[PDB]
Write a protein that binds this ligand. Sequence first.
Ligand SMILES: *[C@@H]1O[C@H](CO)[C@@H](O[C@@H]2O[C@H](CO)[C@@H](O[C@H]3O[C@H](CO[C@H]4O[C@H](CO)[C@@H](O)[C@H](O[C@H]5O[C@H](CO)[C@@H](O)[C@H](O)[C@@H]5O[C@H]5O[C@H](CO)[C@@H](O)[C@H](O)[C@@H]5O)[C@@H]4O)[C@@H](O)[C@H](O)[C@@H]3O)[C@H](O)[C@H]2NC(C)=O)[C@H](O)[C@H]1NC(C)=O
Ligand SMILES: *[C@@H]1O[C@H](CO)[C@@H](O[C@@H]2O[C@H](CO)[C@@H](O[C@H]3O[C@H](CO)[C@@H](O)[C@H](O)[C@@H]3O)[C@H](O)[C@H]2NC(C)=O)[C@H](O)[C@H]1NC(C)=O
Ligand SMILES: CCOC(=O)Cn1c(C)cc(=O)n2cc(-c3ccc(Cl)cc3)nc12
Ligand SMILES: [Ca+2]
Ligand SMILES: [Cl-]
Ligand SMILES: [Cl-]
Ligand SMILES: [K+]
Ligand code: NA
Ligand SMILES: [Zn+2]
Ligand SMILES: [Zn+2]
Length: 783
Amino acid sequence: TNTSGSCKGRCFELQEVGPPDCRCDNLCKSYSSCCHDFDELCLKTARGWECTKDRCGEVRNEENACHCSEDCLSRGDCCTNYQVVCKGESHWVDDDCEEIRVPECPAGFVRPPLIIFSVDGFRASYMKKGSKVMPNIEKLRSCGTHAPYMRPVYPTKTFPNLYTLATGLYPESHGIVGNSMYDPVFDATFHLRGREKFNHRWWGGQPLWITATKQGVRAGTFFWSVSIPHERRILTILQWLSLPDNERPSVYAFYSEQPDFSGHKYGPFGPEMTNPLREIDKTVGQLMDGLKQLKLHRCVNVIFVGDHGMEDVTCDRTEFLSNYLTNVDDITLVPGTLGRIRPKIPNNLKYDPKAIIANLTCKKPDQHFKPYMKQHLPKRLHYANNRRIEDLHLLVERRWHVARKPLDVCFFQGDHGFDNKVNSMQTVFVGYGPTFKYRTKVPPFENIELYNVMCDLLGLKPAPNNGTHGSLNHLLRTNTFRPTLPEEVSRPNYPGIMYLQSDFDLGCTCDDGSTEERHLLYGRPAVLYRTSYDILYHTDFESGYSEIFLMPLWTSYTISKQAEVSSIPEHLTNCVRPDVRVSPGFSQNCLAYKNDKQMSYGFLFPPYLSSSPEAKYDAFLVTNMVPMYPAFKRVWTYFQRVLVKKYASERNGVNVISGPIFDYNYNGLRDIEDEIKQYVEGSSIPVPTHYYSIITSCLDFTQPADKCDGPLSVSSFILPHRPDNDESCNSSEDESKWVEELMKMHTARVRDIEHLTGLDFYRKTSRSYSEILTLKTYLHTYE
Ligand SMILES: *[C@@H]1O[C@H](CO)[C@@H](O[C@@H]2O[C@H](CO)[C@@H](O[C@H]3O[C@H](CO[C@H]4O[C@H](CO)[C@@H](O)[C@H](O[C@H]5O[C@H](CO)[C@@H](O)[C@H](O)[C@@H]5O[C@H]5O[C@H](CO)[C@@H](O)[C@H](O)[C@@H]5O)[C@@H]4O)[C@@H](O)[C@H](O)[C@@H]3O)[C@H](O)[C@H]2NC(C)=O)[C@H](O)[C@H]1NC(C)=O
Ligand SMILES: *[C@@H]1O[C@H](CO)[C@@H](O[C@@H]2O[C@H](CO)[C@@H](O[C@H]3O[C@H](CO)[C@@H](O)[C@H](O)[C@@H]3O)[C@H](O)[C@H]2NC(C)=O)[C@H](O)[C@H]1NC(C)=O
Ligand SMILES: CCOC(=O)Cn1c(C)cc(=O)n2cc(-c3ccc(Cl)cc3)nc12
Ligand SMILES: [Ca+2]
Ligand SMILES: [Cl-]
Ligand SMILES: [Cl-]
Ligand SMILES: [K+]
Ligand code: NA
Ligand SMILES: [Zn+2]
Ligand SMILES: [Zn+2]
């Protein structure tokens, strides 16, 4: 009855067992529900974890933690060094590396098991301490498939990243948006400590262990109560792998709290870090020795993966909100390496976030954080579409903390949580086994991509997630996913001169094809929603004009290394010309811009780069026009006039695709018409929330962008369309002092832009679709 039951013959059972019965599984301690004898029967410790010479051929003592008796191999009970100490065998790490071309599994193994070896807080650069410190991990890394680093999700904390690993989802989608969270609909608080986190209402998406079970693939329990020592976790996985064919799981997970813990205490470059790193490598060696003893070391796929990195952060670098705000005791702050602010009393009517933000904006010249309303955060973070994410956010500068007041502040030297493009936040990925490539390095990738791959490694169909299935095919020897191009949903018109200048009264005054080959280098973008749009050709650019939103969905042009920048003549300053290809009812009008005292306009193709004086008149077409606040125009003009040509000079030409983005509900997805919330004054011209540019050139920078044979090179941005430059604390200075800094912060993946625009790029190339998918997930980080 309840606790008084026994774990005899049930240690680390994979049976689902619930109250009133007592449990003997991985997590029973965390639920305070183990049988009274779980500890003495299942957590055996006697004689340590390694065979000694005097133990070989012993008589089995069931009290020992692991065994060196003759029978132990057939029971899965051996210490992992048994054959080394007693049967003249070599440690796995001492064995020369050899390509595993196909799974070499014992009979009864239908497929290679997958083992996920997760390490908390393993900064990518720890890898550089090499075989001197971590010989087992180095053999995995050098013989298998490795990336130089893996990008975590924001915030770069444990619970958001490991649940992202398990689901393929951004935190805003799976719900674990922090290690601590307040849900205002539950009116409840999620914390690492305590019981609330065990409630299923917090956890969204479909994690890998559920996907597997629902598709008939058995998982071992991924989670381990903190009192189960690491050696016992390894022995338990190995004993599960010894199970009969009709019980043995196909996917396993080990977890280590190190080196996060020592990282927090000693900082990432403390000499104390060698010892946790050695201990982790020893655990890796115990696993691989155990797999060798099972004849499974050439049969199992092993993933060695971290959740985030670690930065130098000390008490001496703490910003205090009480230096900026008068009554900080009235707010609650999720503090440290990020900030989330809400009133201490939920729904307190006196809470004044616009006044708080004002007092936090550019108030010190060396200010070590920046306040954002969450819809203004860089889109690449994907950190806004969830009720658990406070409206007010603080992005904290690397190496610093933010706290409410000094009564809240030595004992720690490291921490993490920062912007997920910060180098110290990057973590590790190594794949080793029959399905991974041999001795292969792959570009860094994002942890959201791994759920699709683990599904591939298991024969599973992934639940809908934020990975791009196929962008990681290059990690794998086989079991690749064959991606298929999405189908165009709306086809374009190619209008000619259906009209004449007399048919147009839009209030606009002006004082005065084979383009596809040169300007549309990778095919036209496919439109993947139902809409109405026209292709418009020009000497210097091409565009896909939308009759519904009154502006191009995309504008595409190529700029050579040698092109010239030219001014706008003073008589063409206010020139806008009707487009005689496009109806008057499907055009913007300049009257609305004359009436709207806060809105101005800009051009997607820049007049500054037209090839000839004649060609420049195309740039002033009403169909090249987009609404832009004067504040944004300070950025956009500097981009068009200075930076595009600088990029062409540096990359040997560049192809540019630019356009608008509408995301008023900040969910990272293309708005439907009903969701657009702002229009030019007294008109129906919608106002974009962001503008994008995709800048492509030849990876081989010695070939011009327009004559490129092989792989491509891409960088992109999604700039916020804002009525002020408050985000840029140096914006009073010249644009050369702050615009590029702004753009670097809003770097983006082509894939981000695709979600936000409903468009599909790079459909016509001499490259495999898999390579293209990789290109679309690339993020240029400028670190
Ligand atoms: C990243 O990938 C994810 C997954 O593909 C994308 O998220 C999906 O987005 C679509 C489009 O809006 C949305 O579509 C349908 O939503 C509802 C049906 O919702 C219910 O059923 C589904 C199916 O089981 C379930 O996944 C949903 O879970 C969500 O809601 C619960 C309860 O609040 C949460 O516990 C859970 O964490 C999910 O929350 C996320 O999604 C909701 C939106 O549904 C957000 O409000 C929330 O803050 C959080 O972001 C739910 O139980 C249907 O009525 C509607 O008409 C659509 O057909 C999916 O629901 C959504 N799925 C998930 C898992 O988020 C996401 O767009 C991708 N991001 C980018 C940038 O590409
Ligand atoms: C934003 O920062 C403001 C400071 O830059 C801060 O203003 C300060 O608020 C207090 C009380 O609201 C003022 O009043 C106290 O001092 C003056 C004498 O100078 C008296 O007139 C008052 O009765 C009272 O004694 C401070 O003067 C004022 N400081 C300044 C420089 O104006 C705001 O409170 C901050 N806002 C938020 C939302 O935190
Ligand atoms: C899911 C929110 O974060 C954790 O639960 C952290 N964690 C802790 C504290 C103990 C533990 O044993 N595990 C194991 C995993 C895990 C995560 C993903 C995958 Cl794919 C495989 C394993 N994560 C944990
Ligand atoms: Ca949207
Ligand atoms: Cl957090
Ligand atoms: Cl909280
Ligand atoms: K105006
Ligand atoms: Na400013
Ligand atoms: Zn962690
Ligand atoms: Zn940590």
